[PDB]
Design a protein around this ligand. Structure first.
Ligand SMILES: Nc1ncnc2c1ncn2[C@@H]1O[C@H](COP(=O)(O)OP(=O)(O)OP(=O)(O)O)[C@@H](O)[C@H]1O
Ligand SMILES: Nc1ncnc2c1ncn2[C@@H]1O[C@H](COP(=O)(O)OP(=O)(O)O)[C@@H](O)[C@H]1O
Ligand SMILES: Nc1ncnc2c1ncn2[C@@H]1O[C@H](COP(=O)(O)OP(=O)(O)O)[C@@H](O)[C@H]1O
Ligand SMILES: Nc1ncnc2c1ncn2[C@@H]1O[C@H](COP(=O)(O)OP(=O)(O)O)[C@@H](O)[C@H]1O
Lengths: 143, 272, 1488
């Protein structure tokens, strides 16, 4: 049994794995964050197949790292948004998420400096307040 | 057994392929003072030792193949590795891509020995001064980072500067249209994957690899000025496996380009 | 019991039992506190020893409890232990509050007063002051951010940064001037933390952070202190990111602070996130990147004790289990170092254990199953696993990962330089770090080289010490010249690149080889340009070295003078001693390391007035368990090891050894088994940790050095942890050795003065030949060019030459003594000494080579010397000897012509003198006079054991004890021999081992000294032990760990060439002390003489044949020649030939001849041919080899006995048997067949009924095997394909000759003890019963090599002492007493009856070994156990030949009737049977 390749399939598997109640919590923006996380996770995992180019070595960006990232997002959103139904996208602790998922999660396995640079580039591109606009591009010039 | 006959055939073919001998460099006090001569002498000694070991092992394999020699434990292990197509551990003393088989390793070793022979001939004809103006392929050398350090030491000693205050600048130009300055060292064989370099300017391209004609390494005093927003730092890996990081070059991207796109697409310089 | 107060759960059962038994003895509880506390090494009490006043750390810093715990009020051990711990935590919290308040007073200040700051630092602990600074800075930054919360406002945060800056300034002035070492460490830690705080505050200022909740501030490690908190333990909380930890408040004492570099911060963040998420972290990455340290620093900063295990290949479990359950109950962290090195099964087991513990930890987010017990896992427990490249599959989901790819060396330096007080630290760091990168890359690779982080750290600490010393020197100069004293002025005008260069040189130049010294300088010129250093000579030390060298007869020099290099090396050793506590003198043996450090110690004692004491310990000879200490698995008693014993003795300061200078020299090879424990001592912590947990602090005066010749097997860890001094062989030039020998000869008498005058005259005579570029030096240079049987060491040849010259002086003294009227005059003395010197070079430099290279050396020395030499046209000077009259007389005249007694032919004892015999006798006499151990190396046989034995028995006062070393030899054998033949006696010098017999020099002859197997690190334990007693003149008794001085004990060894299979080359360090004499096979002339004597003595039985003695011997030699030329060892492993075969030939001919009163020449030729076939033909494998042997013996017989008839003397059926005739006269094959067929019928009727067909090979085999049984100690190595009938014929012969067959019933569970018991039963069944046993062995019955070792000892001694011991030995004694009473011999003592038992076994017991013809297996069997090839005779059954198959077929298919008259003879008959009848019948065709 193998996971079907495809960003769509990876995102579907990630969304199915996470319980539906957790993604739908008091802050309505939380789900948005989770989606971004899922996308980012998918992208990272889908760059593993092109090991010489997408990275430097086949890192173990497994489901444990995704669970850790979900837990970090949960804790930081609960701390920042103390039982608030809506929170402004700027008020989201973006810096905490970027730093933790660049150094602690997804970065503990990264030993090459340039792989860390690539991870930082991905995090700064995706995790930002500008994502909460309808004009945000998850990718550019795909085809 | 037919495996014995075909191993004889391939051993004879390789013994024909590999060059015969390598000449050690002549020691001299003035040459000893020169750091480039020291590095190249170390490389020559290592290459000659490995070449002699490989040639003697192949001769022993051939003698066993005639039946004139019995397979000792080392010889038996070498024969087993040869038949299975795996690289013998004794032969591999320099860093080698993991997936490379025996035949490619012999070809690479032959090319490296040819380069070393040319280098030794040039050094014997002249000296360290001529040794400075030799265009050397980083992949061909056994330890290219030692060569980078040797160039840094040579530039520091020539101008009486300290090593830590020197920084590296890369000028990618054609071999014919190149200027050999005091601090400039020529390097060939570098290949850029993910981009094309024209007039020392990087442009994104869909080509798998663009061969850099001649890279000039220049050691200059630390200007203590921040690098421009168009400056991108590119790793230089030894082989396509991207397991060895020799050093980092700094290029100027062309206008309308984004350094983040350069980071994402995995643009890198490869020695081979 | 341990469930309540789990903190003392840390210790094992041993310490629990000790604390229970010695609960009232609180003074004996300090070891437990050392075990479980991190920094606390003792508890401070009053004189009554009844109230716990406080705690004290290993450095000497102590903390006084605010409310002392009274032990009297709480007699229970656990109650008062818990009270003490709670008191220590509360008092630490209160002191933290006090120091935080004090530093807050210091905080928010324009300037600080140095005196008040130093007083505050002295008042509190290093950990406490660092924590107070952290708390104050954190609170200040939080207040600044609270003010900034408005946004777009003025920034007093700058002031906070400025505040740090200003206090940093005073620190930069505090460490410049001299401080106590403890306050120095406090200042260093405070400076490191202040630099980190300044850097992070600068980063905050750059980021313009204006919110207290901004993540950039939240990532930084924050401390929060709440006086208002009721619980003092919860007053301090360490919050970083979202993770929160309560401070441990446990006393760390003083620990090494780790500069918090970017990476370490990332590590802090990752591990804190992992611990908050309730799963451990794994900081994987290369070696020396901070993996372990970073974990320890994180644990200490939280106030916790980390237990860092070592996961070496040799790893303990029960200790690991107890230590791990102790940590689990305690809650202290546990770190694993290099997890991947563990064995796969070991890895799986430990991974399962940590999986269970981690699952328990996550469940707590509570007891778990550990060692079949319930262990309460505290929530604070954490586990870290450092790896080197992955985690086991069962742990990949339970542990976060982190990459320690590369440490921040450029910062680590800068920060440590600012800690030492260096100005311009940034430039110095940016220079030093790339310089060490260059050293690690550009310098040639060596085993002892090390340029890692630990090096940088040390080098920089040494640089700080050097700068402080230079500051003090300039201050003293200013005090003496003028009075203007200003520390800042001295510091400002002080060059600092020069200080760094000097420290780098003092630390690294000693370890550099001769070629790498200039390169380093060039490297410095590349990194520190234009700045040079000059080494400061130690004039007082140079004078003391000169005096000590004069006193010890060593050559001393300065600079380019002779001995200058050695003096510089001694000075470098002194510098390394000054700047390190752990030394390593690496260099080839003979470089003067031992004498270098001895002379340095003596000079230091005579200079500084501090008397030095040196303890020399050999680590490899002793056992590691005895080296460090033994903990009983059951009684749990701790007996300190040799190193532990001497360290505890030094620490105890019983006789002022703390005042003294103690040097523990680990003379011997180093391997990563024992030194792993020493890794905890060689670091900056300087403590010895024992498996019981008791840790001993290393005193400052103690220095640990490893006088080790090579470092090819030592790990990089130990290489990096101690200073290195390289002693190249060029350090000790030959002229120095010559000068030392001449000075010792001129100064000390040889006996212990007339002979002193003789020695002075001899030294004057040989002074011209011992000069530089003299005769001896050129001869030695030429001798190194030759080939030698063993490895050539310069000191070996020089020592042998010096010993032989001492013998020359003794001969001169003896001549003078025996001629009182005319003492030898000066001219004869010069002639004698010159000629003896030439002979001495000849027999010393080439005494271990073949005759051809001996002749080559003779020709070379004849060419180069001027001493008069013999004028023999072709005879080399070696066959010549130097008479006491100073004349060259031939050795042949010294050779007599003795006629052995007729009954004494081929006897074991008799030795026929010859040229080699007399020459080796003289050499042995000389090397035995000086008691110098020597090794007789030569091919098997070759007359080595007997030549030595004859010399030793000729010597009257030197008894001999033989010890057959095997591949499993261990020093316990030597200890057993020592306690068997010698005794320990208490003398004023000390305990001394001496022979029980007075006035006797016990010679421990070792039959196979190179046979013992070497360890995986190229070390032979017995060889190291022998070297130890030979060079140190004694060893170490491990029962009480005391130096035993050997008295009247000397060693002599013999061995086959190391090139032979199963032979390991000896150590060069050992070979230095033992001259090697090469006893080659006797030449054709020597064999001719020796065996002509034997034949002449033999043939005296029959005078009518006497005149044939001369040719027969020649023939016996002649044929033998081509044998050794034809069946060389290359063809087959057992194709060896020696004079032993010729001796067996002579013995067999004599045994055949003794019965017979008269016998013609043809009968003698028949006997000789029979013996030649039975010796030089059965060993053969191929048929053509046997045909060649038969044809060659035929040709030899006609060549040497021409006037004989070939048909009678050399009849093809050569069958000799005593079955039919009473005497051993040849018998016809048919009559022998009939008799053995009748015996086979009786065999069927009585024993097992298996039909045996009697083909002609069976006759020969049943004859040879019977021959072997009839001879005493008849042992056979039957070789043949299985089923050919080796056991079948062995049982048959044993039954016929009355020997009872005994085979061992071997199964899978047949252990070594079962085989030992069977051997004991057989020994009882053979000697105690006088009943001959045929012992049936097959290699299938062999399940282990130990079986072969016991059999080897049995074959080589006729018995094995190992089997029979204690009650078993007493039962044997009773049995042999009864047996001797029955046979008629009355013996009382155990020794005489044991010897009678050995004689009975050697005459009765007969062991046979059956094996299949595996040629490679044959070689391995020969190499592993030499006895099966030494004296055991082996036959080649092989497979049944074509004739044999034909006879088997006919005899078995005789019953069936393949008689077909319709059969017609074909034109072509495919004949395969050699003797097939010309008409094939149908039955014949079927058998064919
Ligand atoms: N300075 C010196 N001048 C003259 N002779 C010396 C000097 N130093 C040592 N020797 C002599 O040279 C030899 C060196 O022996 P030493 O044991 O010191 O060497 P080593 O290298 O330590 O050997 P090992 O490691 O086996 O102990 C001895 O014979 C000693 O007497
Ligand atoms: N951040 C640091 N600050 C100070 N010293 C450090 C730091 N990182 C590493 N070191 C030093 O580098 C060496 C590495 O030793 P260790 O931590 O055992 O490495 P590893 O576990 O990778 O083998 C030690 O001497 C340690 O003190
Ligand atoms: N000079 C000699 N006189 C008498 N026998 C000798 C002489 N030289 C050699 N031999 C014979 O050679 C054999 C030598 O065997 P041995 O010295 O015991 O072997 P190893 O020294 O290997 O134990 C002896 O059996 C002895 O009979
Ligand atoms: N001379 C012989 N004639 C007939 N059979 C024989 C003879 N020698 C051995 N055998 C056969 O060999 C068998 C036993 O072989 P054994 O001696 O145990 O083999 P190994 O040589 O391994 O000891 C017996 O069953 C017997 O029949």
């Amino acid at each position: 049994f193998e996971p079907p390749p495809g960003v769509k399939a990876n995102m579907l598997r990630t969304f199915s794995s996470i319980p539906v109640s957790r993604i739908c919590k008091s802050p309505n923006e939380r789900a948005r964050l989770y989606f971004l996380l899922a996308w980012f996770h998918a992208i990272i995992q889908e760059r593993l197949r092109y090991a010489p180019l997408g990275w430097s070595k086949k890192y173990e960006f497994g489901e444990s790292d995704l669970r850790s990232a979900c837990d970090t997002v949960d804790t930081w959103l609960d701390d920042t948004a103390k039982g608030r139904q809506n929170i402004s996208p700027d008020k989201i602790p973006w810096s905490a998420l970027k730093t933790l998922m660049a150094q602690s999660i997804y970065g503990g396995r990264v030993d090459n400096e340039f792989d860390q640079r690539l991870l930082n580039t991905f995090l700064e591109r995706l995790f930002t307040t500008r994502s909460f606009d309808s004009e945000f591009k998850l990718a550019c010039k795909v085809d | 057994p037919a495996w014995m006959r075909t191993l004889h055939t391939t051993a004879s073919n390789w013994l024909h392929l590999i060059p015969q001998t390598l000449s050690h460099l002549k020691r001299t006090v003035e040459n000893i003072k020169d750091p480039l001569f020291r590095f190249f002498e170390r490389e020559v000694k290592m290459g000659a030792k490995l070449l002699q070991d490989v040639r003697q092992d192949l001769a022993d394999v051939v003698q066993v193949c005639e039946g004139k020699k019995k397979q000792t434990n080392y010889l038996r292990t070498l024969i087993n590795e040869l038949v299975k197509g795996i690289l013998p551990r004794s032969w591999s003393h320099y860093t080698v891509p993991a997936g490379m088989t025996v035949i490619q390793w012999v070809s690479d070793f032959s090319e490296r020995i040819k380069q070393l022979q040319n280098i030794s001939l040039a050094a014997a004809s002249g000296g360290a001064k001529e040794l400075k103006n030799i265009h050397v392929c980083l992949g061909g050398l056994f330890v290219p980072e030692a060569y980078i350090t040797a160039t840094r030491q040579y530039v520091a000693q020539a101008n009486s500067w300290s090593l830590e205050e020197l920084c590296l600048e890369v000028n990618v130009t054609t071999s014919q249209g190149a200027t050999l300055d005091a601090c400039s060292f020529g390097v060939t064989g570098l290949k850029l994957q993910g981009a094309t370099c024209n007039n020392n300017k990087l442009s994104l391209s869909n080509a798998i690899s663009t061969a850099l004609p001649l890279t000039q390494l220049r050691w200059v005093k630390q200007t203590n000025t921040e690098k421009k927003a168009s400056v991108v730092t590119l790793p230089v890996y030894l082989n396509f496996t991207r397991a060895d990081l020799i050093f980092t070059v700094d290029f100027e991207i062309a206008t309308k380009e984004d350094p983040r796109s350069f980071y994402e697409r995995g643009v890198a310089v490869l020695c081979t | 019991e341990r469930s309540s107060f789990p903190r003392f759960y840390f210790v094992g059962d041993e310490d629990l039992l000790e604390i229970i038994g010695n609960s009232k003895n609180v003074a004996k509880l300090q070891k437990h506190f050392k075990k479980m506390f991190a920094g606390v090494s003792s508890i401070i009490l009053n004189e009554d020893n009844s109230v716990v006043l406080g705690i004290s750390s290993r450095e000497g810093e102590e903390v006084m409890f605010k409310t002392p715990v009274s032990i009297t009020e709480h007699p229970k051990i656990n109650e008062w232990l818990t009270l003490v711990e709670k008191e220590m935590r509360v008092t630490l919290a209160k002191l933290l509050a006090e120091s935080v308040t004090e530093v807050e007073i210091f905080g928010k200040a324009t300037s600080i007063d140095p005196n008040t700051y130093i007083t505050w630092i002295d008042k509190y602990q290093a950990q406490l002051v660092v924590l107070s600074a952290q708390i104050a800075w954190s609170e200040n930054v939080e207040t600044a951010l609270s003010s900034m919360g408005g946004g777009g406002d003025a920034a007093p945060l700058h002031s906070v940064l400025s505040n740090v800056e200003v206090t940093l300034n005073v620190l930069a002035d505090s460490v410049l001037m001299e401080q106590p070492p403890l306050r120095r460490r406090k200042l260093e830690h405070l400076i490191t933390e202040l630099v980190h705080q300044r850097d992070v505050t600068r980063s905050l200022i750059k980021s313009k952070i204006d919110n207290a909740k901004s993540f950039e501030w939240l990532s930084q490690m924050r401390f929060y202190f709440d006086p208002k908190q009721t619980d003092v333990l919860q007053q301090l909380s360490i919050q970083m990111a979202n993770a929160k930890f309560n401070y441990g408040f446990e006393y760390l004492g003083v620990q090494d602070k780790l500069v918090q570099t970017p990476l370490t911060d990332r590590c802090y963040l990752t591990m804190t996130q992992a611990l908050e998420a309730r799963l451990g972290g794994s900081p994987f990455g290369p070696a020396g990147t901070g993996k372990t340290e970073s974990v320890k620093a994180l644990g200490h900063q939280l106030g916790r004790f980390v237990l860092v295990f070592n996961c070496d290949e040799t790893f303990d479990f029960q200790a690991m289990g107890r230590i791990f359950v102790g940590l689990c109950q305690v809650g202290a962290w546990g770190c694993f170092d290099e997890f991947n090195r563990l064995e796969e099964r070991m890895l799986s087991a430990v991974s399962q254990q940590v999986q269970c513990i981690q699952e328990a930890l996550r469940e707590h987010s509570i007891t778990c199953e550990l060692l079949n017990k319930q262990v309460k896992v505290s929530p604070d427990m954490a586990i870290f696993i450092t790896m080197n490249p992955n985690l086991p599959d069962n742990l990949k989901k339970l542990f976060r990962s982190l990459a320690m790819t590369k440490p921040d060396r450029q910062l680590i330096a800068q920060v440590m330089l600012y800690s030492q007080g260096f100005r311009t630290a940034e430039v110095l760091a940016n220079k030093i770090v790339p310089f060490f990168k260059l050293c690690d890359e550009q310098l040639s690779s060596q085993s002892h080289y090390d340029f890692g982080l630990r090096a940088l750290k040390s080098v920089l600490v040494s640089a700080g010490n050097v700068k402080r010393e230079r500051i003090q020197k300039i201050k003293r100069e200013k005090e003496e010249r003028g009075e203007a004293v200003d520390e800042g002025e001295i510091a400002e005008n002080l060059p600092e690149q020069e200080i760094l260069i000097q420290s780098v040189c003092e630390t690294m130049v000693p370890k550099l080889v001769a070629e790498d010294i200039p390169l380093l300088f060039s490297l410095l010129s590349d990194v520190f340009p234009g700045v040079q250093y000059h080494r400061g000579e130690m004039t007082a030390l140079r004078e003391e070295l000169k005096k000590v060298c004069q006193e010890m007869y060593l050559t001393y020099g300065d600079g380019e003078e002779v001995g200058g290099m050695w003096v510089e090396k001694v000075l470098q050793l002194y510098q390394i001693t000054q700047i390190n506590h752990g030394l390593m003198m690496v260099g080839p043996s003979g470089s003067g390391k031992s004498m270098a450090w001895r002379v340095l110690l003596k000079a230091l004692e005579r200079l500084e007035g501090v008397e030095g004491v040196a303890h020399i310990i050999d680590p490899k000879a002793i056992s590691k368990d005895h080296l460090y200490g033994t903990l009983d698995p059951n009684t749990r008693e701790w007996t300190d090891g040799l190193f532990t014993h001497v360290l505890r003795k030094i620490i105890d300061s019983v006789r002022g050894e703390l005042q003294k200078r103690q040097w523990i020299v680990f003379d011997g090879d180093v391997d990563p088994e024992w030194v792993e424990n020493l890794n905890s001592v060689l670091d900056d912590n300087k403590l010895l940790t024992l498996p019981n947990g008791e840790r001993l602090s290393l005193p400052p005066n103690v220095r640990i050095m490893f006088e080790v010749q090579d470092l090819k097997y030592a790990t990089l860890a130990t290489v990096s942890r101690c200073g290195m001094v390289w002693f190249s062989e060029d350090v000790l030039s030959t002229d120095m050795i010559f000068n030392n020998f001449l000075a010792r000869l001129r100064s000390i008498p040889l006996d212990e003065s007339p002979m002193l005058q003789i020695q002075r005259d001899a030294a004057t005579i040989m002074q011209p030949y011992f000069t530089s570029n003299g005769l001896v030096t050129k001869a030695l240079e030429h001798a190194f060019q030759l080939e030698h049987i063993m490895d050539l060491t310069r000191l070996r040849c020089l020592g042998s030459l010096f010993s032989m010259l001492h013998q020359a002086c003794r001969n001169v003294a003896q001549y003078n003594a025996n001629h009182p009227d005319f003492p030898m005059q000066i001219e004869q003395l010069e002639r004698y000494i010159q000629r003896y010197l030439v002979y001495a070079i000849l027999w010393s430099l080439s005494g271990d080579s073949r005759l051809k290279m001996r002749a080559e050396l003779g020709e070379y020395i004849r060419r180069i010397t001027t001493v008069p030499l013999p004028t023999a046209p072709n005879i080399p000077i070696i066959d010549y000897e130097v008479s006491i009259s100073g004349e060259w007389s031939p050795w042949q005249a010294k050779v007599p012509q003795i006629e052995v007694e007729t009954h004494k032919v081929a006897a074991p004892d008799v030795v026929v003198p010859t040229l080699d015999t007399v020459r080796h006798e003289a050499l042995l006499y000389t090397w035995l006079a000086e008691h110098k151990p020597l090794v007789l190396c030569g091919p098997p046989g070759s007359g080595k054991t007997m030549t030595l034995f004859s010399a030793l028995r000729a010597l009257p006062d030197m008894e001999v004890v033989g010890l057959n070393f095997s591949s499993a030899t261990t020093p316990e054998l030597l200890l057993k021999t020592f306690d068997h033949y010698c005794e320990y006696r208490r003398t004023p010098n000390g305990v001394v081992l001496a022979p029980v017999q007075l006035g006797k020099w016990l010679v421990l002859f070792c039959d196979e000294i190179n046979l013992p197997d070497m360890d995986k690190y190229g070390t032979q334990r017995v060889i190291s032990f022998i070297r130890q007693m030979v060079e140190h003149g004694g060893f170490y008794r491990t029962s009480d760990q005391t130096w035993v001085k050997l008295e009247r004990i000397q060693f002599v060894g013999a061995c086959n060439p190391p090139t032979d299979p199963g032979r390991k080359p000896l150590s060069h360090r050992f070979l230095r002390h033992v001259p090697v004499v090469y006893v080659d096979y006797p030449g054709p002339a020597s064999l001719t003489q020796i065996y002509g004597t034997f034949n002449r003595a033999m043939l005296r039985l029959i005078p009518s044949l006497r005149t044939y003695a001369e040719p027969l011997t020649a023939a016996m030699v002649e044929f033998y020649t081509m044998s050794q030329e034809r069946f060389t060892q290359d063809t087959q492993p057992h194709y060896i030939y020696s004079p032993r075969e010729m001796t067996r030939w002579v013995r067999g001919i004599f045994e055949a001849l003794r019965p017979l009163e008269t016998l013609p020449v043809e009968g003698l030729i028949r006997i000789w041919a029979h013996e030649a076939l039975r010796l030089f033909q059965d060993r053969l494998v191929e048929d053509e080899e046997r045909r060649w042997t038969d044809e060659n013996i035929d040709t030899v017989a006609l060549k040497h006995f021409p006037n004989i008839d070939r048909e009678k003397a050399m009849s093809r059926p050569i069958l000799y048997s005593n079955w039919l005739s009473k005497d051993y006269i040849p018998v016809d094959q048919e009559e022998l067949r009939d008799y053995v067929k009748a015996r086979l019928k009786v065999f069927y009727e009585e024993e097992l009924d298996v039909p045996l067909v009697l083909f002609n090979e069976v006759l020969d085999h049943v004859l040879r095997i019977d021959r072997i049984f009839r001879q005493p100690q008849g042992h056979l190595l039957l070789i043949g394909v299985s089923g050919a009938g080796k056991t079948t014929l062995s049982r048959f012969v044993a039954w016929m000759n009355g020997l009872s067959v005994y085979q061992i019933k071997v199964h899978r569970k047949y252990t070594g003890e079962d085989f030992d018991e069977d051997l004991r039963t057989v020994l009882r069944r053979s000697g105690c019963k006088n009943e001959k046993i045929a012992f049936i062995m097959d290699e299938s019955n062999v399940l282990d090599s130990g079986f072969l070792e016991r059999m080897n000892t049995l074959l080589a001694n006729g018995e094995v002492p190992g089997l029979f011991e204690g009650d078993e030995y007493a039962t044997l004694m009773t049995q042999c007493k009864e047996g001797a009473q029955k046979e008629g011999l009355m013996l009382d003592s155990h020794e005489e009856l044991y010897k009678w038992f050995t004689s009975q076994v050697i005459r009765n017991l007969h062991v046979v070994f059956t094996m299949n013809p595996s040629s490679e297996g044959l070689k391995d069997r020969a190499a592993t156990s030499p006895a099966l090839f030494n004296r055991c005779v082996l036959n080649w059954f092989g497979d049944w030949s074509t004739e044999a198959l034909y006879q088997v077929g006919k005899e078995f298919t005789s019953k069936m009737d393949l008689e077909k008259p319709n059969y017609i003879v074909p034109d072509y008959m495919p004949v395969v049977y050699d003797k097939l009848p010309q008409p094939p019948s149908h039955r014949e065709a079927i058998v064919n």
